[PDB]
Structures are given as C-alpha cells and as structure tokens.
Write an enzyme that holds these catalytic residues in place. Sequence first.
Site, PDB file in Angstrom:
ATOM      1  N   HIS C  46      12.731 -48.228  22.475  1.00  0.00           N
ATOM      2  CA  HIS C  46      13.621 -48.263  23.628  1.00  0.00           C
ATOM      3  C   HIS C  46      12.880 -48.499  24.938  1.00  0.00           C
ATOM      4  O   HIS C  46      13.518 -48.830  25.943  1.00  0.00           O
ATOM      5  CB  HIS C  46      14.437 -46.968  23.712  1.00  0.00           C
ATOM      6  CG  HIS C  46      13.656 -45.782  24.188  1.00  0.00           C
ATOM      7  ND1 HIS C  46      13.029 -44.909  23.324  1.00  0.00           N
ATOM      8  CD2 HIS C  46      13.412 -45.316  25.435  1.00  0.00           C
ATOM      9  CE1 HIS C  46      12.429 -43.959  24.020  1.00  0.00           C
ATOM     10  NE2 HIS C  46      12.644 -44.184  25.304  1.00  0.00           N
ATOM     11  N   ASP C  82      12.578 -46.044  16.249  1.00  0.00           N
ATOM     12  CA  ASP C  82      12.294 -46.126  17.683  1.00  0.00           C
ATOM     13  C   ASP C  82      10.795 -46.281  17.935  1.00  0.00           C
ATOM     14  O   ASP C  82      10.199 -45.597  18.769  1.00  0.00           O
ATOM     15  CB  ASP C  82      12.859 -44.916  18.430  1.00  0.00           C
ATOM     16  CG  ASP C  82      12.877 -45.117  19.936  1.00  0.00           C
ATOM     17  OD1 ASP C  82      13.212 -46.235  20.384  1.00  0.00           O
ATOM     18  OD2 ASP C  82      12.557 -44.159  20.672  1.00  0.00           O
ATOM     19  N   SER C 163       7.726 -40.430  27.713  1.00  0.00           N
ATOM     20  CA  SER C 163       8.268 -41.118  26.550  1.00  0.00           C
ATOM     21  C   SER C 163       7.379 -42.297  26.176  1.00  0.00           C
ATOM     22  O   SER C 163       6.907 -43.041  27.041  1.00  0.00           O
ATOM     23  CB  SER C 163       9.692 -41.599  26.826  1.00  0.00           C
ATOM     24  OG  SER C 163      10.317 -42.039  25.633  1.00  0.00           O
TER      25      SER C 163
END
Lengths: 296, 296, 296
Positions: C46, C82, C163
């Site tokens: 993402h 992901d 992240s």
Amino acid sequence: PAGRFTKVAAAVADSVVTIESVSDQEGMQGSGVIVDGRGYIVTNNHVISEAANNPSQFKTTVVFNDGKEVPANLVGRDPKTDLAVLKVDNVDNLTVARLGDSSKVRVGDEVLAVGAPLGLRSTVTQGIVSALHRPVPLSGEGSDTDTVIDAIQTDASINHGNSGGPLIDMDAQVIGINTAGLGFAIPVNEMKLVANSLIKDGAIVHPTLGISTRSVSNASGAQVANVKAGSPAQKGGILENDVIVKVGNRAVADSDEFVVAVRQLAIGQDAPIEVVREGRHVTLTVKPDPDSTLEH
Amino acid sequence: PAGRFTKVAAAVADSVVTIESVSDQEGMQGSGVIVDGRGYIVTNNHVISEAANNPSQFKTTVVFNDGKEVPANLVGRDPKTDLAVLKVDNVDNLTVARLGDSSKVRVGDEVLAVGAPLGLRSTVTQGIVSALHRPVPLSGEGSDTDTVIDAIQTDASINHGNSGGPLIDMDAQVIGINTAGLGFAIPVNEMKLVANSLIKDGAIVHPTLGISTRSVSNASGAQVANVKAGSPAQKGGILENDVIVKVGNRAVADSDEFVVAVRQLAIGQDAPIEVVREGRHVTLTVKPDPDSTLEH
Amino acid sequence: PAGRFTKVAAAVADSVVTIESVSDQEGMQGSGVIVDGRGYIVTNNHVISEAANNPSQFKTTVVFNDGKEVPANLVGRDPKTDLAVLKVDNVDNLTVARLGDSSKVRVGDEVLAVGAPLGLRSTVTQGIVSALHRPVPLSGEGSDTDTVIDAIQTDASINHGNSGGPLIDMDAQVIGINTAGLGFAIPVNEMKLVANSLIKDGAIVHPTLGISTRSVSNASGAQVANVKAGSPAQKGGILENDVIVKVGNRAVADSDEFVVAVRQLAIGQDAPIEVVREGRHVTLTVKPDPDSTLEH
C-alpha cells in the site's frame, strides 16, 4: 534468553482462561483468572452479563491453556464493581494465580495486561501504572446499571482481548482485573473482598443513599440532581442542587468520586455528608441502607 | 525494591504542581513544573489561556505535592510556543526541577510524561522518544491563535492528565513540557529561552514575514496563500502561489515546517527565501519584522 | 551512556529508507528495509500501490540515512500479504538488515517499530508482542483488493510514520514488516518467502478456492456467502450458507482466519474442508487452483 516481560507473561499463562457464552444466535468471549484451586474463576461482570440475565438461552464454558473446554457455572456477579465469579467442577492440577497487594502498587510500576492466550483476539499489553484510586465510569453491558469504580489506571492497552484477565506486576502477581467496559483495572484488594462475598453468598451488598449527582466545578463537587423519597439522604436533610464535597472521610471532586465514596460507607451507621447550600457550608448526617435489603 | 520508572517518577513528584483556574461557572485544571526557587512555574499556554484572556473573572492557584494551595500570578505567556510562566510568592523549601538538555535527546530514549500527582485525572505515562524536531500544529484554546512548534514526539500518552507537566528522562531531568493541545512535548532548550524572556519582560517577540501558507507535495513545500500588504515578504518579492522550499538555512517540507522555520530567523536581518515560481527556481531576500513591535 | 532502545534503533537506522512516489499532483511517502546488498528493498504494497497501478505518471525514489536520493524500480508486489520489493541500482556500501526468525518470537518480547529517520512524519515506537499468528484484515489502498494476513500484533504504535519499516527485536534483527494499512506487522518468515518469489518472478501465486465468507459465532466459523461457478469449492460440493470450521489442518474461527488458512493450502493437491451443514458435520475435498494461472 527469554525477555523480561516474556518470562512474566509465560509464568501466568496457565492461570488465565477464555470465558465464552453462546446462544443460538449470539457469541461472547472474554478472559478470566483462576483464583482458587477448587475451580473458582474471576472475570468482568460485562463479560458474562448477557448469560447471567438470559441463563435459559446462554451456555458458558471455560477454555484453559492446554485447550481443555469445560462447562462453567456463575457463582455470583457485581455490576457495581464489574466483577463476577465462575466455577469449574472437579478440574485437577489447576494453576492458581498468585494474588498481589494493590495497596503496595505505585505510580510507574511496570505491569502486563494479560489476556487468555487462546482467546479469538487475545492480547498481552505492557505499560506502567499511571494513576491510583482513580474513579472511572463503566458502562453497563445489558440491562446492567452503569457504575463507577476506584481503578488502577495504566497506559497498557486494555481491550476486548485482555478484558477480564489479570493486571500483572513484575513479580508475576495479580494486582488487578482488566476491564475494557487510558486503561483501567479493578484493584486486586477490592477484588478479593467482592469475590469472597460472591463465593459465600452468591451476591454482594453495597451501601446506598438514594442520591443521583452531576459534577460541578467552579470558584466544586457532586451536585445533587435527584433524592429518592424516604431515602437516607431525604431523612438526613440532603436537598436538591446541594453540592456534595465530602462523603464520610473522603473528599468528593465530582459525580464519579461520589459514587465510589458512597460504597465505602458503613451500612446502618451514621456518617457525615458535607455540602455547600446556596453558598453556605452545611454538614448533614445520613445512615446508609443496603442496596439489596433481603441479602443484608 | 522500587521499579525503574517508579523511582524516576517519585524523584520529580515534588517539582510538579496542579494549576487550577476558576470563575463563577468555569473550572480548568492543568500541570506545571517548578523551574526556579523564587517560585517560577512553567506550564502550557492553553492551560491558563482563559484566565489570561479573562483575568477579572478567573482566579488561578497552585497545588503542591504535599497539598498546599497557594495563589498564583501570570508572569507571561507565549501562544506561539504554547508556553507560560506563573509565580508563587515567598513559598519556602521548593523542590526545583532539574532541567536537562533536549539537544542531547535521541530517538529511543526512555521517557516519562509526568502529570501533577494530585490533579483530578492525573496521569504518568511511559514510552520512548519517537521523533526529534518534529513540527506539529497546536490548536489555540480561546481567542489564542493556532501555532506550530518543533516538538519532541513520544509514544508516551500525552493527555489532559499530564499536559503542562514535564517530559522526564531516565536521569529524572526535564527534557520537555508536555502539551496535549502520538504525543508531543515542547523541548526544554526552547523552554529555557522562552521562559527567560517571559520572566524578564512579561512577553516574548517572534519574527514574522506576513506569509500564510498551505502544504503542497508533488514532483513540494509551503504554498504561499496570502501575503500581507507592506510585509517583509511583500517588500522582498514573495508572490502568491509561490512554493516555499527553504527559509533561511532550513529546508521547508510543508506549511508546518514553514511556521517553525520563520521563528528561527533573525529579526531585522536579511535572510534568503528559496521558492519555486511557475516552474522556476527563484531566491528572494526578506528582512523579518518583530511580531509585536512595541516590545522590540 | 546510550539507552537500551536508543542503541537498537541506532544500529538499524542505516538499513531503513524513505520511499517516495510522486506525480504532477500527488505525493506518497513510506518506509522500507534493505534486505539484499544488490539493492533490494522491502516495503508495504500500500506504500507503492498507486505508483504500481499508474506507473506512467508516478516516479519512485529511495532516500537513505545519509540523505542520498536514488531512483527506485518496482521488482514485484503482493497485495494479499501487503508486501512489495523495490531495487536500487549499483549503490555501494549498503547496510543490509539482519533478518530474524519470526517463528522464535514470543508474546511479551520487546520490539521497536522503526520508521525511516528522514521521513516527513517518521516515528520509532516501542512495545511488546501482544499476539502471534493473528489474522487481521487489511484495506486495499487503490484498486487493490482487500486482504487478511497472519500478523504479529504489537502494542507498539504502527502508523504512517513507520509503515513499511521493520519491526525490530532487542537483537537489532528484523522480525516483521510494519503495516498501518493495536499495531500489526507482517512476520519476517512470510516476508522472506514472498520476497524471494517477487525477486525471482516479479509476482507471486497464492491458492484459491472461489469462496467468499462472513463470520458466524453461536452454539461458529466462516459462513459461505458466495461460491464461484466452476471453482474448486463448487466442484468439491461446498454449498452456500455452509459454515466452514476447518481448512486443511487449520481450524477456522471466522472469515479472517479462513482467508489466511486458504493461502496455506497446496495448489493442485486435494485438501479437506470441514463444514457444518444444516446442523450436520460434513467434510468435503477441494483441489485449490492458483490465483493467477499463467504465472503457475
């Protein structure tokens, strides 16, 4: 070389259980702690609240560390402290938790909020004690009345995954019971008192005055919003829009502390209530009633 | 055997105070730190903002560790850094905090965000430094203008219970001032500079350019949204929809860093502003004004 | 005297990078980890999702610890985990991260969620492992399909600032990849398997059954909501409103665990699916297909 918290969490895992209540179209899971070798388990009242209120349609089981599933029966529950006691029958070689002393807990103490390892979304979180004797409002789960408790506050995350489980100190001892219903735990010293009464009597009795309050703060306390007819407060002279500042020997900062302070009064014994009435400083005397008279 | 953080929190408790401002129908509480033996206390500007803006109706007091309540007077405040200085008069045996050096703080350093132990919903939280020199926007409490500060960021929870209190390193030394107005603290080195000016002058002067910006990021910086008439920016050639990428010797990533970088300029001295104008790389010269001229 | 976590964070900083993708009117930033001396970098799917789906308009770069900016090319990506792999070309003296073993991670282990030090809003957070093999749903960023992963759960804050960066144990070794898309990380052992396939083949193949489920819990599992025509489930006898309780040798508690369990099946090999159908306990046999047949 296992870590500091890894050791402590692993040392108490055998004493934490998953508590699960199910009907035809509902399922409700929580954590609990084994506190007595005969099979007595402590959890939150909101974990079991619906099974307690609808016992004909809900079935409650306990899942241990090894994976054993065993039927569980409700001994008693206290929505006012969000506590409850279950009992598993004739289970052998139970690992009973070591109960600490919450009066010796201090701000900054490192703690673990331990959930049942086999729970669906189980968590084990870490943090410190952020406050002691902190009144916190708790929302009632079902038809349960909302309440306020003197809580141990922690910055360890208290969530659905560890609610009902123990708050554990660095000596692997239980200092509180996690309640998710910025984290709060029911201190273990109050836990021992409430569970003793629930194990012996299947219920517990708390004092009451017939007062409902809202918080006030200006140039401060619990403002009397409603006084029940014939209540100890009504017989003691407590009026409406009185601002309560002290209940017994405990100062009262707001409505939250008022609820907690009332539960610390002696049933059937005179006690002073200090109020501020239209600017004047007035003291009143009340004799608290039991909240359930036929169990007193 | 007291814990690692238990010792550090207990060692600084005497230096943290509750700050409370009340009117006829309002009550507002915070934390602060004793920074000078004469009675000077540092807190957030948003803790006292309403008492400062409405001093005829608000009364401010300080509550110490032992429980002593003493009147408190506002020395000065800086909404641009969300800092403020109070003063208690002729209080003896004050435990002054030990001020660390925020320039020596590093990412990963263990910290405590300490609130006043007697505050209503006081907290003491624990975590690490998550970022240094991190521009963060702060919302102005009352009629106070919003601002941005170079903050120490921490994953210790910064909340109402410890706002205005100190961020404490493992040497029990103040490295920042907590501000709740994912946690942020005002670094102590900026704190010493701002408090010195507030103690001496009752106010502080920050540079200004007459620029308002919004953030931009593409194949990036602070986009000039409005230039005041007759401002240093207007006299320097700064145009509207210019994209500011450097103010002085500091690169500017967005509108947040632009606000902070401007406050690091020299008042009355030429300084370069690097912009990107309709695709072209243009440098401009501005002479920053004081934001309050009669105090400069 | 640098702190416990300060040392560990500083020891891995050279191995964490900022990943930035920009167009004419968009800008998107994340973190990544250097996993191979040839220039291979792992991040979240993402983080790069929009550059991957719109490669003609987006340009992706890597910013190292020292500040070097280098073009970056997408090797491959896996929205189902992901994960994604980038490659920088002919960069010398790269500090490659040390990859741990997530199978040896235990609940309570102290960890650091490390973001790229130069990222705009970079964070480094600290906590413990709160759960292992925890299925968690992840929202697809662009046109990317949503997914579920067996995650390491941590009470270290996982946010935009860290992240794509590594979850680091106290040995400065990577045990997971942070994903913000109460924190979750992609375990490093799955990371090594997915990145190996992406580096060799530019893509990865996961098993599929043609089943869509919703969670059910009563007196429990994944309820079959839709079966694709001609799918392994349709050819195996799986019906609609079947309640799946076991996929292969893995028990299935809800829809989240069902998605994860399916990805652990062998492609092209028979496997049992245990269901509960109108009260009856039925077992079915399915042969999983590859989700992308021309890459199998």
